[PDB]
Symmetry: C3
């Protein structure tokens, strides 16, 4: 299971860099990247306490966002759902 | 599928690495442009489930990003790869 | 690790590519210093050789140090210390 936490952190670093690249080249808006970066905060916390499922879903969302595949509203929705689901 | 997921991770990674090594002057624009065409072939080979084409395409991109394959060799690899997809 | 298989070596190389990028990202935005990155790159050179030679444990250790450095979590003095230890452990 340490292997999966390792993988999750690898993807978090990768997608965090992808967000910054696609912000710099103008493909994404600042608000979108800020909201995705808040999900990245949740994934980091999820990784800490072992919540693989929350972390994995958060990463899927951040990847979808970095690739312009989901909306600002969908990112805000997923963030609230993920934060609350991490609380349990 | 674990493999498709890994393939997508590597295409993200190598897309970033290619720009990094263009911007710091390590790679020529023309090499990076040819590698970016291979990355399109990988993006497709992933979507299409042609995993071996995806994996070889990423190996060529990685070699290109590290300056380990010549411009002519990248051009030839892309031809061999594009054909191998169809 | 899972042994010095081609699959593990390939994973270690992915991580090194990823951390190569992160060091530059975080040098450029001012998070990391030039001397920190230079020392981290000397660990990256040790990691490279370790990956080649199948020394997955030495490589995983250098990657963990480089990662901790890139996130601003260990001091320049710790990175230098880690580089000396890792070069010897190899
Ligand atoms: Zn992944
Ligand atoms: Zn992606
Ligand atoms: Zn890989
Ligand atoms: Zn590489
Ligand atoms: Zn890794
Ligand atoms: Zn990291």
């Amino acid at each position: 299971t340490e292997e999966e936490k390792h993988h999750l952190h690898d993807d978090l670093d990768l997608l965090t860099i992808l967000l910054e690249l696609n912000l710099r080249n103008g493909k994404l808006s600042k608000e979108l990247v800020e909201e995705a970066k808040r999900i990245a905060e949740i994934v980091k916390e999820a990784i800490e306490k072992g919540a693989v499922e929350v972390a994995e879903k958060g990463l899927e969302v951040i990847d979808a966002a970095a690739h312009g595949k989901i909306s600002l509203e969908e990112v805000k929705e997923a963030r609230e759902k993920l934060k609350k689901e991490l609380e349990e």
